[PDB]
Coordinates of C-alpha atoms in Angstrom, one line a residue:
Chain A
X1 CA -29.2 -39.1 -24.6
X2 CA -27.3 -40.0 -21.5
X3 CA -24.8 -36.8 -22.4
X4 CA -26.9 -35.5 -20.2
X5 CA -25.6 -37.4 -17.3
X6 CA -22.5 -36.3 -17.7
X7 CA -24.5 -32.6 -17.2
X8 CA -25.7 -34.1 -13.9
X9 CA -22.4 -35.0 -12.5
X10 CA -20.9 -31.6 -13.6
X11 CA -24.2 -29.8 -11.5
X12 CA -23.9 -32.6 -8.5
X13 CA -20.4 -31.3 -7.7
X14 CA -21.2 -27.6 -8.4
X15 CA -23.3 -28.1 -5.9
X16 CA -21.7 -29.5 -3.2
X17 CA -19.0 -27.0 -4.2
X18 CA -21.4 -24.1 -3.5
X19 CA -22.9 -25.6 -0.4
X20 CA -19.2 -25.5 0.9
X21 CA -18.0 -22.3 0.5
X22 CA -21.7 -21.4 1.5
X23 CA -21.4 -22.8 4.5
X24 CA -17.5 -21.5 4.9
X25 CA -19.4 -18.1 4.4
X26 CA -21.6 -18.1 7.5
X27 CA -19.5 -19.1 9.7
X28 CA -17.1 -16.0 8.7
X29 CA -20.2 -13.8 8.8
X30 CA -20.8 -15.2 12.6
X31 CA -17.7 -14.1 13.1
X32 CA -17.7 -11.0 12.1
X33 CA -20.8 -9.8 13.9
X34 CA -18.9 -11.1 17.1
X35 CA -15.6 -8.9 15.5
X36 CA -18.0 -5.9 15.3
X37 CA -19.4 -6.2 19.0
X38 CA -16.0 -7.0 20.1
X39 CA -14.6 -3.6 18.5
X40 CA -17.3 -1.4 19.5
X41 CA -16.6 -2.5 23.5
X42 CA -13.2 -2.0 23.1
X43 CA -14.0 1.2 21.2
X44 CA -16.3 2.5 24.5
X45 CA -13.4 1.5 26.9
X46 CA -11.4 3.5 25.0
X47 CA -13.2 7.1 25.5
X48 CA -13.3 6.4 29.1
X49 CA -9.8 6.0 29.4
X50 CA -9.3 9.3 26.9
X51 CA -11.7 11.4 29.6
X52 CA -9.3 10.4 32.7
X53 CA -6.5 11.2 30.7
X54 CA -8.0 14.1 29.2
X55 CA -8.9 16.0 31.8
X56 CA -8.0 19.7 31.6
X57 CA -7.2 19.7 35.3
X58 CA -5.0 16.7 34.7
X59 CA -3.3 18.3 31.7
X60 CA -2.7 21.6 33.4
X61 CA -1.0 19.9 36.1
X62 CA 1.5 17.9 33.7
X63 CA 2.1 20.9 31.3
X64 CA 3.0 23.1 34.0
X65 CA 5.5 20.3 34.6
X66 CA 6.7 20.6 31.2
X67 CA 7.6 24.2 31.9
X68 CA 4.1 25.9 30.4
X69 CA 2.7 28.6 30.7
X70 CA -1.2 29.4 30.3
X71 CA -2.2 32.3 27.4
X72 CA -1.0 36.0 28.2
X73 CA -3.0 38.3 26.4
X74 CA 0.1 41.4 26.5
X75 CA 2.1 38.7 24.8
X76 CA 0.0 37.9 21.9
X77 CA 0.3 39.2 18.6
X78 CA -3.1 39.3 16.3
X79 CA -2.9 39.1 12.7
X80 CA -6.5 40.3 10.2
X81 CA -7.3 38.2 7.5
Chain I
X1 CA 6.8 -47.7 -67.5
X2 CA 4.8 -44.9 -65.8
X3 CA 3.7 -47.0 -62.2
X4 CA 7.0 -48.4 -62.9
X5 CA 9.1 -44.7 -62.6
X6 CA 6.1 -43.6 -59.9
X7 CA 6.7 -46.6 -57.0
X8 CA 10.8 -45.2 -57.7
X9 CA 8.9 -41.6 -57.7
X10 CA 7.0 -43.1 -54.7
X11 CA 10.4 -43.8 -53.0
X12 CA 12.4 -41.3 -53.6
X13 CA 9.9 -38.7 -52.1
X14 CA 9.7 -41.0 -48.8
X15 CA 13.1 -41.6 -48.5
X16 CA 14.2 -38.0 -48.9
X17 CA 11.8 -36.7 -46.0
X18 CA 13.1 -39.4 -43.9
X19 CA 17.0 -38.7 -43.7
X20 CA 15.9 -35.2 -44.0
X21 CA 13.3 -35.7 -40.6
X22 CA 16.6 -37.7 -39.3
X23 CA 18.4 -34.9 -39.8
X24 CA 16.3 -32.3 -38.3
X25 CA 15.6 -34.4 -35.2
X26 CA 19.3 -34.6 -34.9
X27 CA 19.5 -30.9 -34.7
X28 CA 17.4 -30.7 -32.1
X29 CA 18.2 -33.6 -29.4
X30 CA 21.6 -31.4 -29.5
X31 CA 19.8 -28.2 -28.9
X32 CA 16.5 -29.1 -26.4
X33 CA 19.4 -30.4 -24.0
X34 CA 21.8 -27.1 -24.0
X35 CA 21.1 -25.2 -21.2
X36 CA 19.7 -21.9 -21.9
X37 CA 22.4 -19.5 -21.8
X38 CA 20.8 -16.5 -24.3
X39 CA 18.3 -14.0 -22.5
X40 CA 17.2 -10.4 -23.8
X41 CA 15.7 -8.2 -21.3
X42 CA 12.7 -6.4 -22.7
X43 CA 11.2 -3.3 -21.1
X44 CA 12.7 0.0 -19.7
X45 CA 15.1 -1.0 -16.4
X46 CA 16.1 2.1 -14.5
X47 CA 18.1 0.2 -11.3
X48 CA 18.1 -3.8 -12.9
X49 CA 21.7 -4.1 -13.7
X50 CA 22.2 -6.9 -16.1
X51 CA 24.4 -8.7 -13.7
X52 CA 21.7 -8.7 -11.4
X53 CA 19.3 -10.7 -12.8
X54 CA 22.0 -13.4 -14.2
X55 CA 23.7 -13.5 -10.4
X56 CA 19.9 -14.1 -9.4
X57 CA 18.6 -16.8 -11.9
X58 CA 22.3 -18.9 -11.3
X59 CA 22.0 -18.8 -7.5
X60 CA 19.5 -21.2 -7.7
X61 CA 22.4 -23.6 -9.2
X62 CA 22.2 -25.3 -12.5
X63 CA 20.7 -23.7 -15.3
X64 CA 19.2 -26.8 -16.0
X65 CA 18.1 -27.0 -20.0
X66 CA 15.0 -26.5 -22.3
X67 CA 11.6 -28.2 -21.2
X68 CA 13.7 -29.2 -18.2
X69 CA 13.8 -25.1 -16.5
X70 CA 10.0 -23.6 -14.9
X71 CA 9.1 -20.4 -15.4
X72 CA 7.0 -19.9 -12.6
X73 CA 9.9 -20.6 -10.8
X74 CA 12.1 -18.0 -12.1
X75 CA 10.3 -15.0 -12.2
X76 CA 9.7 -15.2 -8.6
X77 CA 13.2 -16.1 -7.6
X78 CA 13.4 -12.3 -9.5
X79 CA 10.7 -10.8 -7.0
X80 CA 12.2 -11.6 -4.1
X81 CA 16.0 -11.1 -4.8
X82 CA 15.1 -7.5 -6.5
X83 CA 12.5 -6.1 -4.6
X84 CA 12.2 -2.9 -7.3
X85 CA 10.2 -5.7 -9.6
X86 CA 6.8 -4.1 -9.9
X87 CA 6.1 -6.7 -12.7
X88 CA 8.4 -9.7 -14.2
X89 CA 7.0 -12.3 -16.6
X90 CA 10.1 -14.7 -17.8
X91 CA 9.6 -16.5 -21.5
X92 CA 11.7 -19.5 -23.2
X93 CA 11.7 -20.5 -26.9
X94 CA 12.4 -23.7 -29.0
X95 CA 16.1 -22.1 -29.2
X96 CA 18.6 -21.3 -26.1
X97 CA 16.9 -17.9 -25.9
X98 CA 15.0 -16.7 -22.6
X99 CA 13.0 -13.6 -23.2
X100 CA 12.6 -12.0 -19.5
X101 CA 10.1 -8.8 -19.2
X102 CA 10.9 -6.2 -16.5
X103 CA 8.7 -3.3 -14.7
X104 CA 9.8 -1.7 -12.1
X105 CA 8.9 0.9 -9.6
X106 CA 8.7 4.5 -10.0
X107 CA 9.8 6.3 -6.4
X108 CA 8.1 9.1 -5.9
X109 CA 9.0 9.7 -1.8
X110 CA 10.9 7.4 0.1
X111 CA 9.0 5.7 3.1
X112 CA 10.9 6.0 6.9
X113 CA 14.2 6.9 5.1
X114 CA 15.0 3.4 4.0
X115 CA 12.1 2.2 1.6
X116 CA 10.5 4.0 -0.7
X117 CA 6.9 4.7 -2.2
X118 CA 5.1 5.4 -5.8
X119 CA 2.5 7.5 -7.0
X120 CA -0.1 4.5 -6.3
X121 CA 1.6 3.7 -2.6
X122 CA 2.7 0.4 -2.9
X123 CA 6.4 0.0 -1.3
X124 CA 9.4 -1.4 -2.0
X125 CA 12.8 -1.2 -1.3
X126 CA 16.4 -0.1 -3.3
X127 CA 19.6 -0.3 -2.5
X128 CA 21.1 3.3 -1.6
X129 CA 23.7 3.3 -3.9
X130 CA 21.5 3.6 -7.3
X131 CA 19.1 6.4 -5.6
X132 CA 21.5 8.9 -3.9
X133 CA 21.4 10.6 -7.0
X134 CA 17.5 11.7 -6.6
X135 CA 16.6 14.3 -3.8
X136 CA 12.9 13.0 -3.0
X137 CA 10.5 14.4 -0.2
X138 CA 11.1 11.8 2.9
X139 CA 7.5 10.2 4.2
X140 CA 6.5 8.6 7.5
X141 CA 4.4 6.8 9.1
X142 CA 3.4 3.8 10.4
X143 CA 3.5 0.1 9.0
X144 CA 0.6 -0.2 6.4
X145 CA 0.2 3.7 6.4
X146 CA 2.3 3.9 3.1
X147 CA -0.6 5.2 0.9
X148 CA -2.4 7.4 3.6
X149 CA 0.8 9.4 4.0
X150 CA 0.9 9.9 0.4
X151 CA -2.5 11.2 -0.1
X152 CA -1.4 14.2 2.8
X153 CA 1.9 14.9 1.0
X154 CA -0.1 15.4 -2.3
X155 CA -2.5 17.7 -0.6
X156 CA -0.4 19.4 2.0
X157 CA 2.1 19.7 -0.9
X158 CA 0.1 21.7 -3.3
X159 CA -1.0 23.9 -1.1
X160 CA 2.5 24.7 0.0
X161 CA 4.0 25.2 -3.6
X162 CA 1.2 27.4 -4.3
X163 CA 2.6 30.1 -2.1
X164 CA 6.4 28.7 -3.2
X165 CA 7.0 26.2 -0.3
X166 CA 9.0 23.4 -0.4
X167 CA 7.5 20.4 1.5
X168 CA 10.7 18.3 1.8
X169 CA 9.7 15.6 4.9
X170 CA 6.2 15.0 5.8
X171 CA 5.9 12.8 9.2
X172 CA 2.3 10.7 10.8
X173 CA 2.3 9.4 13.9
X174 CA 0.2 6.5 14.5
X175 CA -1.9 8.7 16.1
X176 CA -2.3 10.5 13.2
X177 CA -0.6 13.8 14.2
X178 CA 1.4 15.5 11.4
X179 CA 4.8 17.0 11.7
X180 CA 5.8 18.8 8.4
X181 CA 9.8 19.9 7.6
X182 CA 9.9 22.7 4.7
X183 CA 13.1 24.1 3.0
X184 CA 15.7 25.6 5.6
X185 CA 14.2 23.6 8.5
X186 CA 11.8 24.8 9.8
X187 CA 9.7 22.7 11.2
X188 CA 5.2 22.9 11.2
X189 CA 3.8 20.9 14.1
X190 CA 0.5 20.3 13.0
X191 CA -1.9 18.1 14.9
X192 CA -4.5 15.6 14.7
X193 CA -6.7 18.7 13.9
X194 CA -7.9 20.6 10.7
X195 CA -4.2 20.1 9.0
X196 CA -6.1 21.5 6.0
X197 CA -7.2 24.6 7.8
X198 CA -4.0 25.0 10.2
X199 CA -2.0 24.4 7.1
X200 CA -3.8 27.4 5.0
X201 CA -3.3 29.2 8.4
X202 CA 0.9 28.9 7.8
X203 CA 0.9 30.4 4.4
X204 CA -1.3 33.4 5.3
X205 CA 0.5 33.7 8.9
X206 CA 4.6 33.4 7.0
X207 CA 5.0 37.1 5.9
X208 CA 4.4 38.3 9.2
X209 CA 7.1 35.8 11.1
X210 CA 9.6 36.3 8.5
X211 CA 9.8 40.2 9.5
X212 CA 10.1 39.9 13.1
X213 CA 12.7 37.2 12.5
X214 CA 15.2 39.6 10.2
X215 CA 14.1 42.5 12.8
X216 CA 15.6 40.1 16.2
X217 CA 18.1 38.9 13.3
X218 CA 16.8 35.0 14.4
X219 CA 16.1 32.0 12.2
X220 CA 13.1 30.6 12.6
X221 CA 13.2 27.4 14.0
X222 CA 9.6 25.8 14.3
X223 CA 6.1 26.6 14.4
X224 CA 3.5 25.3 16.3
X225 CA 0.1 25.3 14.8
X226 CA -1.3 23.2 17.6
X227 CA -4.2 25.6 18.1
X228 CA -7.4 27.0 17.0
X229 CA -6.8 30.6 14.7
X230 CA -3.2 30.7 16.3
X231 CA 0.4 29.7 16.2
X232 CA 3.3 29.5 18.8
X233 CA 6.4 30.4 17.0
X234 CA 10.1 29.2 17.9
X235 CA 13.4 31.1 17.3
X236 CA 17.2 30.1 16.6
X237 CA 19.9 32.0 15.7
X238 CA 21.8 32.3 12.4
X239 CA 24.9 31.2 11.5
Chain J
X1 CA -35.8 -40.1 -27.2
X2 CA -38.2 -41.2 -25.2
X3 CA -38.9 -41.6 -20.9
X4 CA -34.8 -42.3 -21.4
X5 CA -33.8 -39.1 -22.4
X6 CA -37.1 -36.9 -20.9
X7 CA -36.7 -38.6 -17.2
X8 CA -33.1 -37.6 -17.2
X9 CA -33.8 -34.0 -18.2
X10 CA -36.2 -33.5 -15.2
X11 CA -33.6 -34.5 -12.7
X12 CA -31.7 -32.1 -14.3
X13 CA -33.9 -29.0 -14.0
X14 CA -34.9 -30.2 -10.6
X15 CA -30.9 -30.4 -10.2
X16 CA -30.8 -26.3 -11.3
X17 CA -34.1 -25.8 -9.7
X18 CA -32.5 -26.4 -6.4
X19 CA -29.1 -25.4 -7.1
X20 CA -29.8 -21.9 -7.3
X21 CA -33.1 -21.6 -4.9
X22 CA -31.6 -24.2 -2.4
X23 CA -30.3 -24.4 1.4
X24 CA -26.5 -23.1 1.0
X25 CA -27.4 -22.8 -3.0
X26 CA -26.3 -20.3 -5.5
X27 CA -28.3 -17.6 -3.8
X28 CA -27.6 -18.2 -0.6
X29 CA -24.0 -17.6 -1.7
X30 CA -24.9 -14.0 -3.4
X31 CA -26.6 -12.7 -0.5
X32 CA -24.3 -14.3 2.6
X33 CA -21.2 -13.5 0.0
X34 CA -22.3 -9.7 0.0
X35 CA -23.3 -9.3 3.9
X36 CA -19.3 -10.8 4.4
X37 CA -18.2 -8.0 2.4
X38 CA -20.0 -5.4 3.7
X39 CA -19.2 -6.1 7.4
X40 CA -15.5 -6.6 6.7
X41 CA -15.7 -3.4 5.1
X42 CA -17.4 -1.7 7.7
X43 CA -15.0 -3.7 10.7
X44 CA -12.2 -2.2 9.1
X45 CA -13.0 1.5 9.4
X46 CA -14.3 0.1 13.4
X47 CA -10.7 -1.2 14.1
X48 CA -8.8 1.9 12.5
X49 CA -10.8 4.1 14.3
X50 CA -9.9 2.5 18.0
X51 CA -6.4 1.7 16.7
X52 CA -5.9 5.4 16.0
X53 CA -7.7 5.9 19.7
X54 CA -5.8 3.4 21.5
X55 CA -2.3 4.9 19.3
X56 CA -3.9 8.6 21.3
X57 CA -3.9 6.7 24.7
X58 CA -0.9 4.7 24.4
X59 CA 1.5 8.0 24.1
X60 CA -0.9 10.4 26.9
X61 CA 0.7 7.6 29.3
X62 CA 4.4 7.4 29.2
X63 CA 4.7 9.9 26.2
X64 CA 4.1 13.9 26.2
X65 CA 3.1 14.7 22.1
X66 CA -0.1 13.7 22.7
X67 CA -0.5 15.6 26.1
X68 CA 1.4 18.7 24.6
X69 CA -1.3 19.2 22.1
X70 CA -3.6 18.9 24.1
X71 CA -2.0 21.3 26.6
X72 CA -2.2 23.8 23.3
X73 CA -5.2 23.1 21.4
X74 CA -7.5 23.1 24.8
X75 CA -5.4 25.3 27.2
X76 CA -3.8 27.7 24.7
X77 CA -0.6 27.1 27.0
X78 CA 2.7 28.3 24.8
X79 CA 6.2 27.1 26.3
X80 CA 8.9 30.0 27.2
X81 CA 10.6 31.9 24.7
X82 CA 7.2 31.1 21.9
X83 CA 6.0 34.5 20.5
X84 CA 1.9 33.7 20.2
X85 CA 0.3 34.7 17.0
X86 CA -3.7 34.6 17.1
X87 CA -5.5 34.9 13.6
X88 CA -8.7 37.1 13.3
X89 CA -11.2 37.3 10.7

């Protein structure tokens, strides 16, 4: 009968309802592949700026400043498993 | 005689369950517009006091009345005045009676000294006075770090109490370098490392400290475990 | 019974037909719907891993923790007054 109409109305809007948040979807998942390169730049910046600031020759200099002192074998207990 | 005596039957039937119905409906229009001044609180409340949820429902102003007060409305003017509400779910009834269900939040640690944490790590927060009572380990960390922290404490913690340790304060930098006070103060600076391994390190390492510390009579004060199968121990004196 | 209700019955499996085999159909919502997931997923253990890096470089400028363990774990360097235990298998 035309109760089936009524059926066509009901799939019309699911439709466009699923073509919407479809189309809301890619444009997040655009994003996110730009979100992922964006990280992974920032993420090789990163190391580079750990390696200057890492640098054993740098940390020496600034522990010694902070009243270190390097590994003395005479004063160093050892302990056995 | 019989249709006679049945229209009177007929009559007397209708007319009895209209002043009744008239009666009924009069006991009602004076009860729908009371407001709602009965409510039972259901559930197990361990810092709710019963004057805080009535200050908290009236600060909104008028009670209002029945099918005239949301619900919706209510129980989340209760999450955000008392925020210990794990769960709230507010009910009316045809009477002035307004059934109000509470849950609330277990503390397991408190989080930065102020809020405090459950076993699953949400957070919340409770007022000092109702909680001084509990001693409770002290996590932590940084902003949305409240369940990280938790899963250390857990691990760190049973490794600790299985050689007898108290781990009373467990601290992460954002970082995510680890700073662990146990009973008496002394404090383990762990690192970003192996805290698993440096950790297990401590408790195989303590018997030996402990000696030289009553030998120099000295207290000790930390212990750095920032290393690789080594520790750099600090001293204090006693009191 | 007749062309009346069959003719509005094809438009209506032609309706399903391209509702779930369709441009931006049912689908299309499935598989774009999972690959959103995944990458979010994914991006947040990317951004907790350069947060917890830039959270390293952020204290070895203006801030001595992170340089001090450093200075220990990679230099074996002990401040005065430490007595050095060393664990041996």
């Amino acid at each position: 009968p035309l109760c089936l109409f009524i059926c066509i109305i009901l799939t019309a809007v699911t439709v466009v309802t699923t073509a919407h948040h479809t189309r809301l979807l890619t444009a997040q998942r655009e994003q996110l592949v730009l979100e992922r390169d964006a990280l992974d730049i920032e993420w090789r910046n990163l190391i580079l700026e750990e390696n200057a600031l890492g640098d054993h020759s740098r940390v020496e200099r600034i522990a010694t400043e902070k009243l270190q002192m390097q590994h003395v074998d005479p004063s160093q207990e050892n302990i056995v498993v | 005689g019989t249709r006679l005596a049945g229209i009177l039957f007929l009559l007397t039937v209708l007319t009895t369950v209209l002043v009744s119905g008239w009666v009924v409906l009069g006991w009602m229009e004076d009860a729908q517009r009371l407001p709602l001044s009965k409510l039972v609180l259901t559930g197990e409340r361990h810092y709710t006091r019963n004057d805080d949820i009535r200050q908290s429902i009236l600060a909104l102003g008028e009670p209002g009345t029945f099918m005239t007060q949301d619900v919706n409305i209510i129980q989340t003017q209760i999450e955000q005045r008392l925020p210990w509400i794990k769960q709230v779910s507010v009910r009316k009834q045809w009477p002035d009676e307004l059934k109000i269900h509470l849950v609330e939040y277990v503390p397991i640690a408190r989080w930065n000294d102020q809020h405090m944490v459950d076993a699953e790590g949400n957070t919340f927060s409770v007022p000092p006075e109702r909680t001084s009572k509990q001693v409770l380990p002290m996590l932590y960390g940084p902003e949305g770090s409240a369940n990280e922290v938790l899963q250390g404490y857990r691990e760190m913690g049973q490794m600790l109490a299985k050689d007898r340790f108290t781990l009373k304060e467990a601290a992460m930098t954002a970082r995510r370098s680890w700073q662990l006070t146990l009973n008496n103060d002394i404090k383990l600076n762990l690192g970003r490392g192996d805290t698993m391994k440096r950790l297990a390190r401590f408790v195989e390492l303590y018997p030996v400290l402990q000696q030289q510390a009553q030998t120099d009579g000295k207290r000790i004060s930390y212990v750095d475990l920032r290393y690789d199968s080594g520790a750099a121990v600090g001293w204090a004196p006693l009191p | 019974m007749g062309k009346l209700t069959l003719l509005l019955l094809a438009i209506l499996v032609w309706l399903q037909y391209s509702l779930w085999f369709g441009k931006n159909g049912i689908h299309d919502y499935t598989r774009v719907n999972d690959d959103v997931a995944a990458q979010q997923a994914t991006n947040a253990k990317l951004k907790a891993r350069n947060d917890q890096l830039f959270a390293e470089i952020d204290d070895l400028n203006g801030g001595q923790e992170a340089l001090e363990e450093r200075a220990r774990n990679e230099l074996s360097m002990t401040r005065p007054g430490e007595t050095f235990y060393r664990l041996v298998p």
